[PDB]
Structure 1
Amino acid sequence: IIITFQEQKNERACIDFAISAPQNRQSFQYKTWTFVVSPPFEYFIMAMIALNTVVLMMKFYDAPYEYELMLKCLNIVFTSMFSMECVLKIIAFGVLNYFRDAWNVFDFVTVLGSITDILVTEIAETNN
Structure 2
Amino acid sequence: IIITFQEQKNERACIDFAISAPQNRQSFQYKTWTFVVSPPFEYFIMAMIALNTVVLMMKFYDAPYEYELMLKCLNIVFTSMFSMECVLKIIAFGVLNYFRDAWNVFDFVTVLGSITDILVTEIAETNNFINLSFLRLFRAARLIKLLRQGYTIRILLWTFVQSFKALPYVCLLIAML
TM-score band by shorter chain is over 0.9
Instruction: Measure how far apart 1:19 and its partner are.
Output: 1.1
TM-score computed with the length of structure 2 as normaliser: 0.72
| Displacement after TM superposition at 1:69 (Å) | 0.2
Q: Could you list the per-position Cα deviations for residues 17-69 of structure 1 after superposition, in whole angstroms to 9, with x for gaps in the alignment?
A: 11111210000000000010111100000000000000000000000001000
Q: CA RMSD in A?
A: 0.5
Q: Deviations over 1:91-115 (max 9, x none)?
A: 1001111101100000000000000
Structure 2 unmatched ranges of 5 or more: 129-177
Once the two structures are overlaid, the 10-residue window that deviates more, 104-113 or 6-15, is 6-15
Between the two structures, name the one with larger relative contact order (CA 8 Å, sep ≥ 6).
1
Hey, which bits of structure 1, 4+ residues long, moved more than 4 A? none
1 CA distance for matches of 2:100 and 2:32?
A: 19
User: Which is further off, 101-110 or 13-22?
Assistant: 13-22
> How many residues are aligned here?
128
Partner secondary structure for residue 6 of structure 1: coil
Q: Percent identity?
A: 100
Which residues of structure 1 form unaligned runs of 5+?
A: none
